[PDB]
Amino acid sequence: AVVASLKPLGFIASAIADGVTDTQVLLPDGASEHDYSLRPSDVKRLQGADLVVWVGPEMEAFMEKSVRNIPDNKQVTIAQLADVKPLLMKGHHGEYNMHLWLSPEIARATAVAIHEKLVELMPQSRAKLDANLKDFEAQLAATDKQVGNELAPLKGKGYFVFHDAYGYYEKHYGLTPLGHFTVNPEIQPGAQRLHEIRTQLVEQKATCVFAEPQFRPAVVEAVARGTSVRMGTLDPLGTNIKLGKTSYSAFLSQLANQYASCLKG
Numbered sequence: 001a002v003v004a005s006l007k008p009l010g011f012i013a014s015a016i017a018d019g020v021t022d023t024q025v026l027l028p029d030g031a032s033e034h035d036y037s038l039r040p041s042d043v044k045r046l047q048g049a050d051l052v053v054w055v056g057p058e059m060e061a062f063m064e065k066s067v068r069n070i071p072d073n074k075q076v077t078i079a080q081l082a083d084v085k086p087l088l089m090k091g092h093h094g095e096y097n098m099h100l101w102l103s104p105e106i107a108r109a110t111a112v113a114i115h116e117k118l119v120e121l122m123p124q125s126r127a128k129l130d131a132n133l134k135d136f137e138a139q140l141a142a143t144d145k146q147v148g149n150e151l152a153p154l155k156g157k158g159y160f161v162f163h164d165a166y167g168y169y170e171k172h173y174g175l176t177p178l179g180h181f182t183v184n185p186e187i188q189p190g191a192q193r194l195h196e197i198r199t200q201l202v203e204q205k206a207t208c209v210f211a212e213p214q215f216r217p218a219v220v221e222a223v224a225r226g227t228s229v230r231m232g233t234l235d236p237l238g239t240n241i242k243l244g245k246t247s248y249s250a251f252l253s254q255l256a257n258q259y260a261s262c263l264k265g
């Protein structure tokens with residue numbers, strides 16, 4: 001199997017490995033992209049994998065050690081790919097935005113790297129692997145134009161988010177985010193921070209504020225109450241999307257819909 005750290009990376013791998021080997025994802029729904037704790041069973045999946053796919057030590061810090069052991073011909077570390085380098089953005093600590101799975105260009109570079117490594121590992125399946133990369137690239141191209149069309153009219157419509165995960169997607173599709181607030185998903189912030197957040201929402205004429213799905217509706221409501229800012233939801237991990245050939249395209253289109261549901265009109 002191909003073992004991917006995060007579900008969207010599993011979407012990309014599942015397109016390339018389709019009909020050749022299974023794809024498996026390590027990180028559950030609602031878990032921390034940085035500080036999840038791998039169980040011994042997860043390390044064992046990793047050590048047993050045909051290929052491991054992850055962003056790198058500045059994102060999934062939780063698997064850095066586990067993956068040290070694994071030879072280069074059996075891992076794709078997306079942040080380290082030569083074709084990804086120039087695409088890495090200043091804009092989770094560290095200096096560079098590591099939410100790489102939301103960049104269509106990096107997703108393509110990721111698919112290419114996975115394909116190259118799988119062809120080297122499984123030359124008996126070269127033609128199937130080639131066909132799969134062909135279909136992934138065709139769908140990504142089609143998706144890119146369609147999403148690009150759907151989001152173009154939303155340019156200049158400002159919004160805020162709670163998790164600054166979206167910068168690659170936003171820059172690529174010309175969305176205009178106003179910034180983000182550090183909010184606890186469980187607890188509505190203290191009066192002073194609630195005041196500063198609400199004044200920024202109003203001061204900048206934000207059309208929307210976008211929560212993540214692990215957010216209690218109450219704390220979102222508290223952030224938005226009495227402002228005229230509409231409430232939306234974004235899922236940067238596509239948790240409701242199943243693995244398979246069309247999954248990464250479905251992910252990009254779903255995110256666009258999620259933006260457009262709130263920002264529209």
Ligand SMILES: [Zn+2]
Pocket residue numbers: 033092099163164165
């Ligand atoms: Zn993040």
